[PDB]
Design a protein around this ligand. Sequence first.
Ligand SMILES: CCCCCc1cc(OC)c(CC=C(C)C)c(O)c1C(=O)O
Length: 264
Amino acid sequence: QLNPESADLRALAKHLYDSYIKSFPLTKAKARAILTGKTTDKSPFVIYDMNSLMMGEDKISKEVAIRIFQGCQFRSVEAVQEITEYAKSIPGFVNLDLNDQVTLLKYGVHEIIYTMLASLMNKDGVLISEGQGFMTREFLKSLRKPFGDFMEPKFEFAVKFNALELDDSDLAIFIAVIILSGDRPGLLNVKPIEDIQDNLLQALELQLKLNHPESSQLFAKLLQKMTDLRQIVTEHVQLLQVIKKTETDMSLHPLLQEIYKDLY
Ligand SMILES: CCCCCc1cc(OC)c(CC=C(C)C)c(O)c1C(=O)O
């Protein structure tokens, strides 16, 4: 037995998953198949040092660390665009006060970036350039200060987050829950946001119970990961303050600039 209330939650889950696939070109399922070797055709070129970097750099001038960081900032900008497209599909989102929509995106995009970045990670590195490349965790750690530390907390989070074994259908709802957070600073009308999140939370809970019936309290464990994300973002923003002051010759994309502007 499942009922009409639960039926509407399944319809919501379906809609979100559909929109997620439409918005995010490289899904977790694709990322895993690339990372696991379901493959003679999907094998990534692996960047693990300077030469391999130079070699890989014909499928994608200045210092290596800056090239990587700026490559990372550019992909973040693209992720922001994809996440914004996805957000508009969340029912109710575009009906919210325009200021609140902006606020939700402002505080939500980075937490989603790191959630979804985990899909592209294992303990040994991260998929890059639409999955055509793989950059090792050790290579990123070897970068001159203050870059050698920029990806470490993301990997640390990914390894733990990935142990939840969520699939894209789960993630579609979870990232919707993240965006529709009524606790964001400066929100004008919290109640309409809370009402949407409540329904998302309901959809998320049913989704995890059906998809992961033997994974006890998965719902609670997932919600607790919010803390980790919030912390990654805080550290990232701090590191960015360091970069701005040490690398005055390194331009930061304005979209990212505005998101970081007076954040937490
Ligand atoms: C000389 C550029 C090397 C790749 C830069 C890069 C770096 C990078 O950080 C290691 C990432 C993933 C990171 C985020 C989405 C934050 C990337 O997706 C990419 C990319 O797609 O090009």
